[PDB]
Amino acid sequence: QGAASSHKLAEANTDFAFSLYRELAKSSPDKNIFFSPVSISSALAMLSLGAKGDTHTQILEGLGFNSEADIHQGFQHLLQTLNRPKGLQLKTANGLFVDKSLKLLDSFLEDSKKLYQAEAFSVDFDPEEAKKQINDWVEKQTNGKIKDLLKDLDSDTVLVLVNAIYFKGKWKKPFDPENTKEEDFHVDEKTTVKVPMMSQKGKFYYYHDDELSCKVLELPYKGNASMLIILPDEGGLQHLEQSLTPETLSKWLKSLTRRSVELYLPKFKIEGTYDLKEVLSNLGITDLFSPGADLSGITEEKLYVSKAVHKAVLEVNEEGTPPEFKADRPFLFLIRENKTGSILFMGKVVNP
C-alpha cells in the first residue's frame, strides 16, 4: 500500500546486488564476473508491470520487497537520476520482443516507456532474421559496443528480454601513460599473465580491513561515480566473497580515509553474459521463465519469458582529466553512483 520510499529502493537494490553477485560467483569460479545489478533490478520491475498472481510475488520478493509493495514510482525516479546529464550517460539497451500475433495491452506499452524508458517490440520469431534484427538493434543502441549479442534462437520463442550495457569511464585523477609498464598478473599459483600495469602516486580514500584481510580503495569517476576496488590479502578471496554483504560495504565506506597510496592497477577489459533464467532461479524468480507464467498484464494471451540475456562490458584504462595498492592478482570491484548509492556494477577480475 503506497509507492515505496527511495530508501526502500536503495536497500532492496543493494541486497539484491550482493546476492546476485554471490550466486554468479558460486556458479562460475575462476571466471571474470561483470554485470549491472541495477539494470537487472530494473528489467524485472518493468516485467512486474505485467505480472499478476504469484508470478508477481516471486519477482518483488526476489528484488527485495513486500508482495504488496509498490515500486514503480521509485524506480522511475531513480533511473531519472542515473540517466541525467550530470551523470554517467550510459550507452544502454533494453528491448522487449514479443511474438507479433500477440495483441499487447497498449497501456503496458505506454508505461514501460515513461516509467522505465525501455522499448518493447512485437516481432515475428522465425529463428533466423529475428536474431539479426535484435542483435543489430542492440548494436545500434550501444553505438557498436555490443555486437552480435544473441547466440541462437529456438523456434518456439515468444518473448525475448534483452538487457545490455557498455561502460568506459573517465577518471577524476588520470594515470600517466608513461607509468604504464608491463607486469606479471598472478591469476593463480600456476598461471601467469602479462598485463599493462597503470601506476599512480597520489591521495585516494583507502582502508586496510584486516578483520577481512584485504585492501579497499576508491577511484573517482568523472560523472559523480566511484570505483570501489577490493584487493584480498594473499589467497583469501574465497572467504572474502563469503563476507560480501551490504553491511560490510557500509563498514568499508565508514572506514575509508584519504591517504597517500602508491596505486598499481592493470588496464583491462572484461565482460559478462548471463542467462537470467538460471541465475534468478536460485533467487526464487522462477515462474516468469516458464509456461505457466502470469503476464496477462502484458497480453490476454498465454505467455512467459522464453529467453533473457543480460550482458555488461567494462573497459578500464588511464584516461583522463605510504601504503602500496598493487592489484597484480585476482580482485573484486564495484562501481557505485555517488548521489544515489546505487550499485551500477559489480565485478570480479580474474583474467584481465
Residue numbers in the entry: -4 to 316, 331 to 361
The authors write:
With the aim of changing the specificity of conserpin to that of α1-AT, a conserpin/α1-AT chimera was previously produced, where 9 residues within the RCL (P7-P2’) were swapped with the corresponding residues from α1-AT. The resulting chimera, conserpin-AATRCL (379 aa) has a 61% sequence identity with α1-AT (148 residue differences). To understand if there are any structural changes caused by modifying the RCL, we determined the x-ray crystal structure of conserpin-AATRCL in the native state. The overall structure of conserpin-AATRCL is identical to that of conserpin—a structural alignment reveals a root mean square deviation (RMSD) of 0.2 Å across all Cα atoms. Like conserpin and indeed many other serpins, the RCL of conserpin-AATRCL is too flexible to be modelled into the electron density. Importantly, conserpin-AATRCL does not inhibit HNE, the protease target of α1-AT. SDS-PAGE using 1:1 and 2:1 serpin: protease molar ratios reveals a faint complex between conserpin-AATRCL and HNE, but also showed a large amount of cleaved species compared to the complex formation between α1-AT and HNE. In comparison, the formation and stability of a complex may be hindered by the charge−charge repulsion between the electropositive S3–S4 binding pockets of HNE and the electropositive surface of P6−P3 of the RCL. Despite P7-P2’ of conserpin-AATRCL being identical to the corresponding region in α1-AT, the overall flexibility of the RCL region as a whole was not reduced to the level of α1-AT, while the hinge region of the RCL, which inserts into β-sheet A first during insertion, exhibited higher flexibility in conserpin-AATRCL compared to α1-AT.
Inhibitory family members typically fold to a metastable native state that undergoes a major conformational change (termed the stressed [S] to relaxed [R] transition) central for the protease inhibitory mechanism. In previous work, we designed and characterized conserpin, a synthetic serpin that folds reversibly, is functional, thermostable and resistant to polymerization. Conserpin was designed using consensus engineering, using a sequence alignment of 212 serpin sequences and determining the most frequently occurring amino acid residue at each position. The reactive center loop (RCL) protrudes from the main body of the molecule and contains the scissile bond (P1 and P1’ residues), which mediates α1-AT’s inhibitory specificity against the target protease, neutrophil elastase (HNE).
